[PDB]
Design a protein around this ligand. Structure first.
Ligand SMILES: Cc1cc2nc3c(=O)[nH]c(=O)nc-3n(C[C@H](O)[C@H](O)[C@H](O)COP(=O)(O)O)c2cc1C
Ligand SMILES: Cc1cc2nc3c(=O)[nH]c(=O)nc-3n(C[C@H](O)[C@H](O)[C@H](O)COP(=O)(O)O)c2cc1C
Ligand SMILES: COCOc1ccc2ccc(CCc3c(C(=O)O)[nH]c(=O)[nH]c3=O)cc2c1
Ligand SMILES: COCOc1ccc2ccc(CCc3c(C(=O)O)[nH]c(=O)[nH]c3=O)cc2c1
Lengths: 313, 313
């Protein structure tokens, strides 16, 4: 009875990892994520130069989830690269590194220099496609030319296995169009569904005011709010992309939540809001809880039920 | 103190109404809503010809909301017109008739016939833009060129003030694009944000099965999952649409949920999932609660705080 996985030519103690941006920005966060019992970790999405991100308050959590416009605060690509190559203990867990450049050019520059470290050290690229593109156009994944463009360019630049990180979609034509694009590109070996549910609005009834400062209080949503949306996307992409791995992310608080992800077709399972709110000690609970469920049903390995969600007659 | 208002040359006792879909398909349903305390009511979206809809189960509710792929079951537009025409008691409350034909032609056919009654009776048109096409192309609203056609054509054929049911958007550029489309049309006197959050997927851990039968489990989401998304859209369209009313829909379970909708700029506030789950008694509760919040804060009229959410700094 176990949680172990082998994929992307790496061995994982379990399927649990943090979500990009959560408890991963600093050498402290990273070391801590490593000391945790997560199966893997991923580094805060990075740009070429260091960033301050947006004004505070910019994250707020609630019984039902969280809202954010961090604005991509991060220590700059050089820091995350030195971490991959010099600092991270790969004997503990695989490292993923997440890049979120503000243009296609910026993203090519980084992967060119990552590629040698990716080859030698084994760190794995999660390209963040829910990244802003020219103001007045939709974020990259909502713009299927920009996405085709970004992936040709990065593929050529990097020439190695890597995954992408997708925003949620809500039409079938959007699921159909998005997977066909990703299918064109044989080096995209995993797909992470999903990023935050874009541009929600949280209002406080007592103060009659928005709760985050940037973007008139408009921001990305996660947590309990988004689980169904996250499970739909995972299962949609798992069905449409059989030569690729889907990584599940969206409202995981419990073993059960992760079990549903895995049932939908998830291979790795990421925690954002819940992790942010509960702390790295969440990972041992999640493991135990999933394992208790597997036991109740006599499941002995993840593969016994991944993607095995049933439909109705 | 009371929550009376005047919109679109009609008086409402309060700002509450069902959402299209809920408690409004049969003549029983409509007599029921008319006998409720709702300020108004809206008919199940209809097509030219009666529809059986999708295989059951096609709707499910859980503590955090609901999922549906009804597939547009309705008695057919001839029945709803007769109800508008000979049966509804206008002394009791305003009626709204919702319309969701499969083609722009199907919609042009219904509205021409609806205009003489709208003039004669005062019934209000809510065109549903979450309708087919196709498959192979996104719903009308997620497709800004079709939306402009549909509006052109209906605007030409109806020629009276009418309103529009909008799916949720998740990106600023879409909010901008969407709004500029609806602003083209001086006849679109009101917007209803939002319709269900498209294509979520609820899975049941015990049976390891999806919960609605249509579309391999995939269907629209309502309830407590969708409130901030509904509030992002009410607010977003209130700012961009200064000559239109905004109607709020999504995640209303309480006076506080309605209050938040009004703050974002809502004039009418709609209830679907809660109404489905609690019954029309909900309107007296919701009234009391909102009225209590108002009394506590020192507000006398809806106009005092509509659209008045505070941003930070
Ligand atoms: C504070 C915060 C920062 C985030 N930063 C990133 C990021 O830098 N790159 C990225 O791809 N996703 C980022 N995300 C998205 C999360 O990784 C995840 O997709 C989303 O929050 C849903 O996860 P959850 O619902 O389990 O919280 C961030 C989310 C939060 C709340
Ligand atoms: C069972 C059901 C049927 C619905 N039918 C329609 C419909 O015919 N036309 C429409 O515009 N919206 C329809 N809706 C959408 C609702 O009117 C509303 O936009 C959505 O459910 C969010 O509101 P809620 O959170 O109060 O449930 C339906 C929703 C449900 C749950
Ligand atoms: C070019 O101007 C930069 O300003 C912004 C504004 C909003 C942003 C939202 C998300 C992000 C990037 C990555 C990210 C973030 C984040 O760092 O804000 N938050 C998320 O919930 N998901 C994410 O993928 C950058 C932004 C930059
Ligand atoms: C052309 O084939 C018709 O089959 C479908 C399939 C999915 C549909 C989804 C929504 C709807 C329409 C109206 C509607 C419905 C509904 O009747 O399913 N449910 C909602 O939550 N919101 C709605 O606006 C019709 C569908 C018809």
């Amino acid at each position: 009875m176990c949680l172990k996985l082998n994929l992307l030519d790496h061995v994982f103690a379990n399927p649990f990892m943090n979500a990009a941006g959560v408890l991963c920005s600093t050498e402290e966060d990273l070391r801590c994520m490593t000391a945790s019992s997560s199966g893997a970790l991923v580094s805060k999405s990075c740009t070429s130069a260091p960033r301050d991100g947006n004004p505070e308050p910019r994250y707020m959590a609630f019984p039902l989830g969280s809202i954010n416009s961090m604005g991509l605060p991060n220590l700059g690509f050089d820091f995350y690269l030195k971490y991959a190559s010099d600092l991270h203990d790969y004997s503990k867990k695989p490292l993923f590194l997440s890049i979120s450049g503000l243009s296609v050019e910026e993203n090519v520059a980084m992967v060119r220099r990552l590629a040698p470290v990716a080859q030698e050290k084994g760190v794995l690229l999660e390209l963040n496609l829910s990244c802003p593109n020219v103001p007045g156009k939709p974020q990259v994944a909502y713009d299927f030319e920009a996405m085709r463009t970004y992936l040709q360019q990065v593929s050529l630049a990097y020439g190695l296995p890597f995954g992408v990180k997708m925003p949620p979609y809500f039409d079938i034509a959007h699921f159909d169009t998005a997977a066909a694009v990703l299918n064109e590109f044989p080096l995209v070996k995993f797909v992470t569904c999903v990023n935050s549910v874009g541009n929600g609005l949280v209002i406080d009834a007592e103060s009659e005011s928005v709760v985050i400062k940037p973007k008139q209080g408009f921001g990305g949503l996660g947590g309990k709010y988004i689980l169904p949306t996250a499970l739909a996307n995972v299962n949609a992409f798992y069905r449409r992309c059989p030569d690729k791995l889907v990584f599940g992310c969206g409202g995981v608080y419990s073993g059960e939540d992760a079990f549903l992800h895995i049932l939908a077709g998830a291979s790795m399972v990421q925690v954002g809001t819940a992790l942010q709110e509960e702390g790295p000690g969440i990972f041992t609970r999640l493991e135990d809880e999933l394992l208790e469920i597997m036991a109740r049903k006599g499941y002995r390995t993840l593969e016994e039920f991944r993607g095995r969600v049933k439909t109705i007659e």
